[model samples]
Target: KQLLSLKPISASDSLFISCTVFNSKGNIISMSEKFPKWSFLTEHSLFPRDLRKIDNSSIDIIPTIMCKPNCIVINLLHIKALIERDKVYVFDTTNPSAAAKLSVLMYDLESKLSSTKNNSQFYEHRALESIFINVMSALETDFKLHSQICIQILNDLENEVNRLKLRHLLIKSKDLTLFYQKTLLIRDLLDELLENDDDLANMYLTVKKSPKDNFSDLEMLIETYYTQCDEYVQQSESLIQDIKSTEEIVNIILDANR
Candidate 1:
């Protein structure tokens, strides 16, 4: 199969967002504002649609991790990256906060990628693991921050249910529900990836370069993160239930008074 370069297609480089490229040694090769053409990425056995997930114009964004033959397309929370055996490219995000987080991610990726301590993990596997750690921590941090606010409101309501306090509680409940759903979707994505053996096998981008039935390393890596995500899911679910029950009890008290 050959790529038919039929005719010249006039496309501008600014059409696509830039990405931070790192080599196998975890050294930053380049980080530009606008580069890495679409055609260049598709050359790595990825489809145009796969590239879109990391692009700025991601219409339907969700937590996804696509295991392709040559690379792993990662789209978890806001960390968009492509993991290959000897190279990793983290795409830039339009959101200011997410973009700032990417800076710390770069350091984590560098240390994780450069290390050759045990040789237990392949290069691509290291990249995947580092990204997973970042996403999990982000989820945990957000959960704690939001949960604390809900708890403060709940505590105050228990003593005296001010009309303003009740209104705040209602708003927080909705936010918590949405956050819970996002966490659930992330857990499901991990579960979906684990269920498919072919994907697990293919994830060995380095091993597959030669030829693997031993996918336990990748399997266990994903399972560890999956377990963490599931824990958060349960915690948030219970918190939401607590909020709902409090809401119901408050309603009853108000009714009895009337």
Candidate 2:
């Protein structure tokens, strides 16, 4: 099994849309842009056989179905991977040759679980990692921030800031509930990844490693992520309780006024 040469596939190339990144449950993630090239290759690749050719192409916009309610189906195409406890990065593209390149880059960015991460003449590993960091800045919208906003709203409501209306209370509770749902889902996802040493080890998939690096690298990340998840869970629970109290008061006021 050898890739003689990775023939560059243009975005207009028939294979331009040949890849779709999905999770364990078949949900699609972002794919390679149509007009790009990856002058890179991988020692191996992500190959999952569960993808059925759905034959839907409106000028080749890609999307996969959710296989289950808890299903985090992320199709990384050649990048068979889970994130730091399965961040669920999905990609879809129609180019076959570019599959390996993009998948490797995703894995490289998601999991640099080694000292010798990326030392290819063609690809600067750290450079791509930095790019992925900027791309993932979307993560700044964290559970803590959501809690702060909602909690602040709760406090300000209690203070009767600007004649706090029943509407404001409803908004507060709704926001808390929404925030709770999102964080809890992410918390469960992280928990599944860190369920045990074995589960954690499954995620440190940058390159093949000895059993030694496996437990150490995997455990450290698990410990760190577990603490983070626990904190978010605690914050969510606290905020939701306060939100309930506020909602109850708002309901009582509404009844009295009626």
Candidate 3:
């Protein structure tokens, strides 16, 4: 019998993950199926908790973005990544559903980050903005699809009032409610970030390397997305109201007939 449990493991043995790495100039420096070790990543000064947010092993799908001394940990929808002043490391998502979306996100990230033509914004800011762009686009796409499907079902219910359609409307109503909660959570993440001056100031990864104080550039970036999130919340709120009113009317009509 082999005594594997009793065997000693060396400190030299390390864990690694395959990832797509891009330079600040937005060029593909390494497409490492080769993978980089966790130890190697922490050499950049990232905390283990920061790494946990973007780690593929993490089952939590909630969107979160955190700023550290040297990097930003991003977990927005399908994007699991870390952006430093000089490099962007995009980790592979374990979820099967988001793989296709991740490819599209990769393309957008490359193009947006590469646009040094005007060259006004800092590289880290461009990286941050690119992630936000893809995330917001995905949110809108899902919200449109969800609302359209539910609204069509609602219209059908008004015409027929069948049991099957009523069942579907109930299920979709639940889905829309869940989605509404998610939208609010994302908005809350932005809201929290905007209110915290310390985090906002620290987000200037480039400047921190070089912060006397002002992070107006980073402030403006987050505020722009925060406003967009607010719009999504408003849309979700109104949609919920529409669904509730329709449900109430249907119940009253059924009661009167009975």
Candidate 4:
């Protein structure tokens, strides 16, 4: 199980911010903290007790994914991950859904770690590689879900443009723009994972409790994730072009009718 540590973004500055926290029972609990800054980190047994608050809509919270017997703290709020021989950590920032998002991801990965029945050495030696595989699974799911929405938006806007539904087209253009913003954010995160040297190198999922005795071939596997991100970026960029082309047609038609 992991923990979430939250602090205010403007803690250094003198500004008034309010905070809200959810407890393991999924109740909105009142907090007497000075500012509206809140954050949390990994692990939840039935709920994040000592850390479990069922705040489904916690905004502005950072996520810290602490892993293994060694306790690697991955902080996403500031975009950092550290790994040791038997421990790994990942941090995430400012997503109300980070806690929930990571909760599933962590559970899935932890289950993998615990169920090494046959070849303990294989899982331990390539622990980081396995961990990344799990991460990519969820990331790819995000890509697919968001990509579907983008496709629908494109189809709607394109079809409406011909029907002279200028207002509908205009509304969808805004939706397209918003989707672009979201995709770009995901792109930056993928790029961060690709570019960070220490992060890429230290994803081994072994600890003193379940350490590995040997190693395996590396390098290409981690790079594989970066490649997948590239594919996602390409798909996103392709969608953007479609939207832009549709926008141009709409503008032209509106201008000509005027």
By lDDT, the best candidate is 1
The window of 10 residues in a row where model 2 has the poorest summed lDDT is 35-44
lDDT tens readout by residue for model 3, 185-214: 889999989878777777877765223477
Question: Candidate 2, residue 255: CA error in Å?
Answer: 3.6
Candidates sorted by TM-score, best first: 1, 3, 4, 2
- List TM-scores for all candidates, in order: 0.88, 0.48, 0.85, 0.51
True-vs-predicted CA distance for residue 225, candidate 4, Å = 1.5
| Stretches of candidate 4 exceeding 4 Å from the true structure | 1-82, 88-96, 117-127, 162-216
What is residue 61's positional error in candidate 3, in angstroms?
2.6
Better lDDT candidate (2, 3): 3
Kindly list the per-residue Cα lDDT of model 4 for residues 1-258, writing each as its tens digit.
Answer: 575774556545222223332222222244323332233333322223322122323443344334434334333322233344533233332454554565454454445544546244434334444455655565567667666765776677666655445455456556555544554554565566545545434444442321232223433654576576567667766866776787788889878998
Report model 1's TM-score to 2 decimal places.
0.88
Candidate 1 lDDT score relative to the true structure: 0.83
Question: Model 1 — which ten-residue stretch has the worst lDDT?
Answer: 207-216
Cα error, residue 57 of model 1, in Å, equals 4.1
Error in Å for residue 64 of model 4: 12
Where is the poorest 10-residue window by lDDT in model 4? 44-53
lDDT-best of 3 and 4: 3
Give per-residue CA lDDT, model 1, range 146-238, as digits (tens): 899999999999999776898898898887888799899999999999988878877888766322366666788999999999998998899
Residue runs of model 1 more than 4 Å from their true location after superposition: 1-13, 57-59, 209-212
